[PDB]
Amino acid sequence: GSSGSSGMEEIQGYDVEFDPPLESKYECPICLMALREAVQTPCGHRFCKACIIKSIRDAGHKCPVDNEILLENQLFPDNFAKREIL
Ligand SMILES: [Zn+2]
Ligand SMILES: [Zn+2]
Numbered sequence: 001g002s003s004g005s006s007g008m009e010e011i012q013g014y015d016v017e018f019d020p021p022l023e024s025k026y027e028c029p030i031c032l033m034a035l036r037e038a039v040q041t042p043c044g045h046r047f048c049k050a051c052i053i054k055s056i057r058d059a060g061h062k063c064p065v066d067n068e069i070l071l072e073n074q075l076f077p078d079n080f081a082k083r084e085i086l
Contacts, residue, residue, distance in 0.1 A: 030055060030064050040077045043068045049075070 028035050030051040037049035043063050047055070055064045056072060063070050 038078070039075060041070060042074050042077065043070055 026035070026046045027033065028046070028048050028051055030047055035046065035048050036051070038046070039049040039052065040046050041052065041063065043066060045063060045065055047064065052064070052070075052075065053072065055062075056070070061069050061071055
């Protein structure tokens with residue numbers, strides 16, 4: 001009379017650690033990553049020339065942070081030149 005045999009096993013591994021990258025540069029509150037073009041806004045914020053363009057066509061003329069009536073044409077403040085039907 002052996003009566004077979006039984007047992008039990010449990011393996012676990014917890015660990016809560018992380019190293020935050022150097023955040024010493026205005027980041028994009030839209031995509032949450034390094035600015036693509038690094039374009040500024042007239043309202044008073046900084047976003048990716050691409051992100052800002054998507055936010056407008058996506059939702060509409062509004063800031064992704066303050067939702068303030070903002071237009072595209074009113075962008076590209078970094079450019080020290082305004083070539084208009086020159
Ligand atoms: Zn972005
Ligand atoms: Zn804004």
